[PDB]
Design a protein around this ligand. Structure first.
Ligand SMILES: [Mg+2]
Ligand SMILES: [Mg+2]
Ligand SMILES: [Mg+2]
Ligand SMILES: [Mg+2]
Ligand SMILES: [Mg+2]
Ligand SMILES: [Mg+2]
Ligand SMILES: [Mg+2]
Ligand SMILES: [Mg+2]
Ligand SMILES: [Mg+2]
Ligand SMILES: [Mg+2]
Ligand SMILES: [Mg+2]
Ligand SMILES: [Mg+2]
Ligand SMILES: [Mg+2]
Ligand SMILES: [Mg+2]
Ligand SMILES: [Mg+2]
Ligand SMILES: [Mg+2]
Ligand SMILES: [Mg+2]
Ligand SMILES: [Mg+2]
Ligand SMILES: [Mg+2]
Ligand SMILES: [Mg+2]
Ligand SMILES: [Mg+2]
Ligand SMILES: [Mg+2]
Ligand SMILES: [Mg+2]
Ligand SMILES: [Mg+2]
Ligand SMILES: [Mg+2]
Ligand SMILES: [Mg+2]
Ligand SMILES: [Zn+2]
Lengths: 125, 95, 211, 64, 25
RNA sequence: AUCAGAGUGGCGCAGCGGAAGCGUGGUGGGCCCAUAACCCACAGGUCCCAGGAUCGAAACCUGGCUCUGAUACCA
RNA sequence: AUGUAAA
RNA sequence: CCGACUUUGUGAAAUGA
RNA sequence: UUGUUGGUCUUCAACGAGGAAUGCCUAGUAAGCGCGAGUCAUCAGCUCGCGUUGACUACGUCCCUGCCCUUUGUACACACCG
RNA sequence: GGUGAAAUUCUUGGAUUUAUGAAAGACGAACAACUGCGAAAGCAUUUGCCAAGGAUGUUUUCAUUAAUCAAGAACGAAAGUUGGGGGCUCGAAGACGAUCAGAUACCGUCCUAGUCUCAACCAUAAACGAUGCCGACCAGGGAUCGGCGGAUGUUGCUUAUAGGACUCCGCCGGCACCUUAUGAGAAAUCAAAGUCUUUGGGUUCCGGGGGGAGUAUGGUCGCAAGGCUGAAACUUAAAGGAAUUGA
């Protein structure tokens, strides 16, 4: 039986969010920041891997046997690259024993954006 | 001193070219001056391709590739080492 | 919390070869929260490969909508058409040109829908030219042909048979053979179908197309 | 609950770390002689040495 | 941007010189 | 003119009887080619003055001295 | 952050 | 401004006793 | 003599492994132990040599401090302590 | 959420995340280039309408009607101004959280004018190719864009060819690029910055060591901000350009 892992892997955190095949029922939503103490390590690959195993147990406790991936970066008018937890989290629910269906990048892409934060000269730090 | 003949951008016959936002810092730079790389990457590095094809239920699933066109300003391109300071003689190689 | 939830079978209509896209769950009926009529419009998005046992159509994300529920089976109807991010972004490259067209369409049953087509100009073999561009006057002519074909290759009875055109690309391959004398045009498809509005429920309609 | 798993250094890659204090190696799991993953060892280590590993999911990246 | 800011220092100074002359008028 | 307020480390300030500190400043090492900044320590007090009571006072009442705000109208 | 007037 | 009763009848469901 | 030094008895201090900092060191090496020579009438807690016991660690990196070569920028040339 | 790390901030009145639909306003990704069009400024979603334009083609027509230009005139990014409209996003000012010796900054949060549009002003930009316009001569090459001419051979075409897509050759006109002096230059560089002491094709604007200073004053234009015109007293031995070796 298939669920959908709406994985949100940005910088500064990660969301492993499993829903039904309609998106209208949440099933389990563990995030990277529930598994560590420091704000800096919320986006770490380890916290990403810890979250996914927690997801898999709660999924194997509920009968869904395989799942579909939807990787997601911040998108919009910010980065399109998925964050540092993307592959590490995905490698976990595969190595955790639950199966994957089809994998798609659903990062929000404008046909052209509203003005981006930071000003004309950009983040100069 | 005029460092370059093109002035640092490709703009001939034009008067104005619309700017773009740097991916890293969001500094505005004209589209013909930016460093533009089309990146074709895999969802997972080859470290974790077999143990994700072991989990695919449907046989023959090729893992899709993330496609992006990333823009940089000169300072972000230099600082990340996407382009380097070249010698005076090598500055003229466009390959 | 999950002990009060009852699952359902989601079934595609009969013009899709395989059925049973998967399972959904709904909380059991209470006061003012009835499972049966309370939700009823779930929208489902499933691959066309999973749906016709043909990986040769691994793109074309089919969007599906629940019109009615009958005794522990969620009866679903065709709701839309779209490409994967990777497939559309696989097609589009530099040194080429891209043509887009769209038109609003009525079927004989009153589904209002958009269709979007996309095409890409083809390098002929023996080309030594480094780029493959049509001219703007040519670009307009192809777009006008794209739109007209959409109009007349549509204006056919219903999404029952209209989807039967979308599946084997009855539209896209016919775009090329329609206008091969203006410019080659490889990778023609119908990239998207968005249903603007549908008529009233009309329960007789559903089971005739659905299993 | 992690189970201490043994691996063998098939080969040595480089000396990473700011001070170079970390030899990066490729390890061979003994339960399944198929899993070749990168790990980061401290101390002198050659091929044929056997590393005790508490976790395994922690995988070193290239030039980590 | 020294020359640009020097132009601003003249711009402010000259504005104040005009305000004085209106008062004396 | 009366009356309220306030006098405590070099300075600005806290301190409810067992009873003295906060910031900054001082002094001696460290870091530096050398100063700052930073690091480690060290030393500070007629608690305005004279009383008086008080287990026991810088604090509580009384007198003396100096700074500050106030209210002083009808003619 | 900074760098003899003492040549 | 706010509540009850009155005007004030009819019948249907969900949690309540 | 403001005790050259070596004896004998007596006197029995600080010091409980040393804060911020910081030095030298990769095999007969570090560290421990003593001996000889210089100065020298007398005085060696010093320096230059000698032998005796004898390891821990590493077999690397450019992170801090510096060095060499190349490329690059400079409004510096008593030369960035510019 | 945000970050070097955090904090301001949001959050069991359910934040973030997920899904269906709606509204609003901006923006027009990828394609997109050492490519196009425009006097410049500038101009990228579709389609229709209105007027304009360059180039090419021409055994059409006029017949010197031209080049450049004081005075005078049209347009002129962004910001800014006066009124309406709109007010998503971003965001001068302001307010906070960090950092710091301090931080009125960089970083982070919230946000006003503004951003967008209609009417009218303003007239400035490193408004740059830091290179006025017209004409001739002068060196070699492959690309490319628009038109035209010349070649058989090929198509997912085409009632058949003909045309359209592609290959080769030539001409004209564009945006450029590469290699080289027999050239020039202080050189960097430049096939136009060449045809200069062997100095003369035409014409407009403009410079005369560095500052004071695009300042004062008078005039004039503008609602204002300001624009245009624009000194002097005085001061000073250099300021500056290209390239070399070192640090
Ligand atoms: Mg320079
Ligand atoms: Mg042009
Ligand atoms: Mg310009
Ligand atoms: Mg500056
Ligand atoms: Mg000191
Ligand atoms: Mg000091
Ligand atoms: Mg000073
Ligand atoms: Mg000074
Ligand atoms: Mg001796
Ligand atoms: Mg070595
Ligand atoms: Mg520079
Ligand atoms: Mg000098
Ligand atoms: Mg300095
Ligand atoms: Mg929610
Ligand atoms: Mg074009
Ligand atoms: Mg577009
Ligand atoms: Mg502020
Ligand atoms: Mg000007
Ligand atoms: Mg100029
Ligand atoms: Mg000429
Ligand atoms: Mg041509
Ligand atoms: Mg040409
Ligand atoms: Mg002169
Ligand atoms: Mg002069
Ligand atoms: Mg200059
Ligand atoms: Mg110079
Ligand atoms: Zn940048």
């Amino acid at each position: 039986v298939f669920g959908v892992a709406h994985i949100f892997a940005s910088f500064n955190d990660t969301f492993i969010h499993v829903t039904d095949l309609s998106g209208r029922e949440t099933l389990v939503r563990i995030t990277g920041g529930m598994k560590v103490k420091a704000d800096r390590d919320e986006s770490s690959p380890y916290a990403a891997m810890l979250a996914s195993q927690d997801v898999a147990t709660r999924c194997k406790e509920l009968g869904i046997t395989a799942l579909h991936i939807k990787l997601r970066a911040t998108g919009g008018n910010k980065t399109k690259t998925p964050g540092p937890g993307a592959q590490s989290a995905l490698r976990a629910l595969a190595r955790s024993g639950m199966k994957i269906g089809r994998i798609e990048d659903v990062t929000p892409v404008p046909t052209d954006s509203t003005r981006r934060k930071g000003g004309r000269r950009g983040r100069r730090l | 001193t005029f460092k370059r003949r093109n002035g640092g951008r490709n703009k001939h016959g034009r008067g104005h070219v619309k700017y773009i936002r740097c991916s890293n810092c969001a500094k505005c730079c004209p589209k013909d001056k930016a460093i533009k790389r089309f990146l074709v990457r895999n969802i997972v590095e080859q470290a974790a391709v077999r143990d994700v094809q072991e989990a695919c239920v449907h046989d023959g699933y090729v893992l899709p590739k993330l496609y992006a066109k990333v823009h940089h300003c000169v300072s972000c391109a230099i600082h990340a080492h996407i382009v380097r300071v070249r010698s005076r003689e090598n500055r003229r190689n466009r390959e | 919390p999950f002990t009060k939830k009852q699952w359902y079978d989601i079934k595609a209509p009969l013009l899709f070869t395989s059925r049973n896209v998967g399972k959904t769950l709904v909380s059991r009926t209470q006061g003012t929260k009835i499972a049966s009529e309370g939700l009823k419009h779930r929208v489902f998005e499933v691959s066309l490969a999973d749906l016709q046992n043909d990986e040769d159509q691994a793109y074309r994300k089919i969007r599906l909508r629940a019109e009615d529920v009958q005794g522990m089976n969620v009866l679903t109807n065709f709701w839309g058409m779209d490409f994967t991010t990777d497939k559309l972004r696989s097609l589009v490259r530099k040194w080429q040109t891209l043509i887009e067209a769209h038109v609003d369409v009525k079927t004989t049953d009153n589904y209002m829908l958009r269709m979007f087509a996309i095409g890409f100009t083809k390098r002929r073999p023996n080309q030594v030219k480094r780029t493959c561009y049509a001219q703007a006057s040519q670009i307009r002519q192809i777009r006008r042909k794209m739109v007209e074909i959409m109009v007349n290759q549509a204006a056919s009875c219903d999404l029952k048979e209209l989807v039967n055109k979308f599946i084997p690309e009855v539209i896209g391959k016919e775009i090329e053979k329609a206008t091969s004398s203006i410019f080659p045009l490889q990778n023609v498809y119908v990239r998207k179908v968005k249903i603007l509005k549908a008529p009233k429920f009309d329960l007789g309609k559903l089971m005739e197309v659905h299993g | 609950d992690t189970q201490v798993k043994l691996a063998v250094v098939v080969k040595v890659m480089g000396r990473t770390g700011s001070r170079g204090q970390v030899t990066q190696v490729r390890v061979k799991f003994l339960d399944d002689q198929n899993r070749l993953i990168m790990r980061n060892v401290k101390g002198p280590v050659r091929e044929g040495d056997i590393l005790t590993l508490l976790e395994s999911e922690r995988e070193a990246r290239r030039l980590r | 941007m020294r020359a640009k800011w020097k132009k601003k220092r003249m711009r402010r100074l000259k504005r104040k010189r005009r305000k004085m002359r209106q008062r004396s008028k």
